[PDB]
Design a protein around this ligand. Sequence first.
Ligand SMILES: [Mg+2]
Ligand SMILES: [Mg+2]
Ligand SMILES: [Mg+2]
Ligand SMILES: [Mg+2]
Ligand SMILES: [Mg+2]
Ligand SMILES: [Mg+2]
Ligand SMILES: [Mg+2]
Ligand SMILES: [Mg+2]
Ligand SMILES: [Mg+2]
Ligand SMILES: [Mg+2]
Ligand SMILES: [Mg+2]
Ligand SMILES: [Mg+2]
Ligand SMILES: [Mg+2]
Ligand SMILES: [Mg+2]
Ligand SMILES: [Mg+2]
Ligand SMILES: [Mg+2]
Ligand SMILES: [Mg+2]
Ligand SMILES: [Mg+2]
Ligand SMILES: [Mg+2]
Ligand SMILES: [Mg+2]
Ligand SMILES: [Mg+2]
Ligand SMILES: [Mg+2]
Ligand SMILES: [Mg+2]
Ligand SMILES: [Mg+2]
Ligand SMILES: [Mg+2]
Ligand SMILES: [Mg+2]
Ligand SMILES: [Mg+2]
Ligand SMILES: [Mg+2]
Ligand SMILES: [Mg+2]
Ligand SMILES: [Mg+2]
Ligand SMILES: [Mg+2]
Ligand SMILES: [Mg+2]
Ligand SMILES: [Mg+2]
Ligand SMILES: [Mg+2]
Ligand SMILES: [Mg+2]
Ligand SMILES: [Mg+2]
Ligand SMILES: [Mg+2]
Ligand SMILES: [Mg+2]
Ligand SMILES: [Mg+2]
Ligand SMILES: [Mg+2]
Lengths: 145, 93, 190
Amino acid sequence: MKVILLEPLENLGDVGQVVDVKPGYARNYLLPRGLAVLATESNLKALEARIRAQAKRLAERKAEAERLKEILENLTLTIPVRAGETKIYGSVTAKDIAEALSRQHGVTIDPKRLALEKPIKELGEYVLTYKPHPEVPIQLKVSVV
Amino acid sequence: KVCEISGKRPIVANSIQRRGKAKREGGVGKKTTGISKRRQYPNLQKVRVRVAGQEITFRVAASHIPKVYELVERAKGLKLEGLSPKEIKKELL
Amino acid sequence: KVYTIDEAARTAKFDETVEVHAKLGIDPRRSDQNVRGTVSLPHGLGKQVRVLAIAKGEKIKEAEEAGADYVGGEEIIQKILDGWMDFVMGAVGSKLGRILGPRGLNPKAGTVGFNIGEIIREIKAGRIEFRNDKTGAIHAPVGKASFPPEKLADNIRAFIRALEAHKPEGAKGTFLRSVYVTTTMGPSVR
RNA sequence: UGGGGUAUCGCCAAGCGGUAAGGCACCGGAUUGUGAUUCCGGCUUUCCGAGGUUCGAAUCCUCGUACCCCAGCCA
RNA sequence: GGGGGGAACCUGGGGAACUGAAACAUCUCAGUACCCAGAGGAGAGGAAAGAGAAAUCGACUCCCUGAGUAGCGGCGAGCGA
RNA sequence: GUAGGGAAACCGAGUCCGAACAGGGCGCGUCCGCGGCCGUGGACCCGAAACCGGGC
RNA sequence: UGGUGUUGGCUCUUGGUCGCGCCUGCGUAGGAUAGGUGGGAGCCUGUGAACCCCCGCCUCCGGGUGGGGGGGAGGCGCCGGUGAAAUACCACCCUGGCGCGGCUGGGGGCCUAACCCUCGGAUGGGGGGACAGCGCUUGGCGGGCAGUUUGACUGGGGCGGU
RNA sequence: GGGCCUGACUGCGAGGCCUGCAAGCCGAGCAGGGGCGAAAGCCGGGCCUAGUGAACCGGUGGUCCCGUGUGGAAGGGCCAU
Ligand SMILES: [Mg+2]
Ligand SMILES: [Mg+2]
Ligand SMILES: [Mg+2]
Ligand SMILES: [Mg+2]
Ligand SMILES: [Mg+2]
Ligand SMILES: [Mg+2]
Ligand SMILES: [Mg+2]
Ligand SMILES: [Mg+2]
Ligand SMILES: [Mg+2]
Ligand SMILES: [Mg+2]
Ligand SMILES: [Mg+2]
Ligand SMILES: [Mg+2]
Ligand SMILES: [Mg+2]
Ligand SMILES: [Mg+2]
Ligand SMILES: [Mg+2]
Ligand SMILES: [Mg+2]
Ligand SMILES: [Mg+2]
Ligand SMILES: [Mg+2]
Ligand SMILES: [Mg+2]
Ligand SMILES: [Mg+2]
Ligand SMILES: [Mg+2]
Ligand SMILES: [Mg+2]
Ligand SMILES: [Mg+2]
Ligand SMILES: [Mg+2]
Ligand SMILES: [Mg+2]
Ligand SMILES: [Mg+2]
Ligand SMILES: [Mg+2]
Ligand SMILES: [Mg+2]
Ligand SMILES: [Mg+2]
Ligand SMILES: [Mg+2]
Ligand SMILES: [Mg+2]
Ligand SMILES: [Mg+2]
Ligand SMILES: [Mg+2]
Ligand SMILES: [Mg+2]
Ligand SMILES: [Mg+2]
Ligand SMILES: [Mg+2]
Ligand SMILES: [Mg+2]
Ligand SMILES: [Mg+2]
Ligand SMILES: [Mg+2]
Ligand SMILES: [Mg+2]
């Protein structure tokens, strides 16, 4: 008997997948124990829902990333730092960079998964990254004056 | 007794007592030693089923058993309640 | 596959190793089977045919060039048969069961020849190109096949050994065959 | 009515494609008060019998015969 | 809205035996008597997943004929489109 | 009812069995009324011992 | 009482079938353990071989196969000979065999969640547990009940005889 | 007692014995294909009267036959047993 699973199962399964088992198992173990559900016509075209109501939701995050990687994986910025030769006195914690972008160019930053590690503090140019899936390794110049 | 879904119930029937060799084989014909009435039952069974918040069971034949677990479905979009298992089952078509 | 893909004949000493091996209804009840004498083979593939014209020592003059090469007589009977190191065939017609030289003393001696007034004719053939292979209690079939050099013109046993389907006295299914020896063995219907 | 099983030395009976194995039966011989049980040796061979298979077949296929079982009907 | 009742008629759910066969078990009597239920002035059934051989017909119901035909049958008694 | 033989297909005063063109086997009303007898039905009239159903 | 339904998980466990893969077959002569039959005069080694050692299984105690290491360019058939059958190696297929495999089966353990028993009233906890129970189906034991049969003649009826 | 044979026939049957019915029985001859005899002829089992069983139900051979729309089947019928 065809039935749609939920919380996966050793022996057979994985949310969504559809394997079939003897009426018994079904009706007396899976269906009452909320394990899996009937594979009706009903909840059939319905699994289509979450199969695409997530497949096309995930494609959004993937599509707001790669769509800010061809418009922001190529920008390098220029930082208004102050010091003199070697070290500064103001590293540049993420946010800083962001206030030098969210407002210096116009880009809301998520000041953490940006690839910046221990605060900078020294003149020169750098590269970082971002995002969880296809990222966006964006450089950045630390200046003077 | 009589299934509650399909409505099956005991039918009556005779049991034939033949003897002899069918003429489809050896031949000579085939005789009948004894008849007599008796009844065939519907293989009904019990089917307890959660639903709403109660239990409610069923006098259904293994034949229309699926149909039971099939109602519990089409009623998920219903307002079945009140301490009425007796009424739950009722409106459960 | 497709038909008789001779191509499978694709590797050593001149390709004349391909066979026709099959299998069928084991010697049922009383009767059985036995291929025919000198199955022509619509190719011929000039093989070393030894039509030993057991004639009266005269059909060695036109039996040497009409469908063979060398020939003997009633001398391989009791002069070259006395010793087992000097001795096919075609028995004397009429009333002469030549069962005094070839019978038992385990080879060829089943079908004879035709041309009492000369060991040939005015269109000499049907005596030099093939042979047979009777019924081996267990594994029957096993027939002679052709050689590499021809396309839709090499499969000469697909028509020959094939239609030889003229022994079916009363048995079962005669399938399970293929072709080739000193090589491999493919799979093609019939 | 189908389909099995056999019948081989004298009694019952082992039983592979290359060969006839045993006990018992009787006979000779040793021992025996006497007497079973002993202990050796044999004793007996168209293996039902007619075809074909095979280089040959008791031992394997067809066929015919006798009897043994199973199962099965009986106007 | 029901429950209860109504001469006979109706339909559905169950359902004998004497008897017949010149005894008796298939068979017959009989789906009758009779138990129960439902309906109504009637009930039933009714618009083809049909009939059956006609290049056909064209709900159902009921009467006459079809015909004691076809067939059924310890092919008996006898049952019957 | 004017057609009958034949298991039948089938032919026809014929026909069936038959190798036969021997034989032989089978080959010409209805509708009412009245009466006798017969069939199915309780079938001249009373009479069992009993069997079955549902009730008391 | 078999089968099937209500009946579900898990592991072990053997069959029977077909696939395929590797072995398998020791009369007397023959280099010996030769399965039939067909092709066949040339193949196998760097697509790393003869003696050797380790190691598994078969045994007709001689003989057989696969895996690995050493090693390094040889082997084996036509031949011949013998025998009814000859030969490498390439097939197709018999007798029995195992090995993974499809499809089916037979049993054995253990589980809970059907079902059943039950527990100061329980959406539960305990116990049995895939068995029992009940439906359909199969064959049987069955005067406990049920329908009926148990002939005629006949110096009365039975008994005897016909 | 011996030699050749198989009439221990197929088609049929005028005419009668018997006789409640059904059965039982005898039969000359004609046609077909035969046997023995030279021929006339004879032969459709047995010197002779006992050696047996209606129908129903089936089975095996045959065969012209029927064949559920038509073709073919299944299943029937007829002859034989
Ligand atoms: Mg009957
Ligand atoms: Mg079902
Ligand atoms: Mg003394
Ligand atoms: Mg017996
Ligand atoms: Mg009312
Ligand atoms: Mg009322
Ligand atoms: Mg009724
Ligand atoms: Mg009665
Ligand atoms: Mg009576
Ligand atoms: Mg009636
Ligand atoms: Mg009736
Ligand atoms: Mg009216
Ligand atoms: Mg009305
Ligand atoms: Mg209506
Ligand atoms: Mg019809
Ligand atoms: Mg019209
Ligand atoms: Mg209409
Ligand atoms: Mg009768
Ligand atoms: Mg009736
Ligand atoms: Mg030796
Ligand atoms: Mg020798
Ligand atoms: Mg347990
Ligand atoms: Mg439990
Ligand atoms: Mg409980
Ligand atoms: Mg059970
Ligand atoms: Mg009694
Ligand atoms: Mg009665
Ligand atoms: Mg009575
Ligand atoms: Mg009397
Ligand atoms: Mg008496
Ligand atoms: Mg005489
Ligand atoms: Mg008379
Ligand atoms: Mg006469
Ligand atoms: Mg004469
Ligand atoms: Mg004469
Ligand atoms: Mg006489
Ligand atoms: Mg009849
Ligand atoms: Mg018949
Ligand atoms: Mg029809
Ligand atoms: Mg038809």
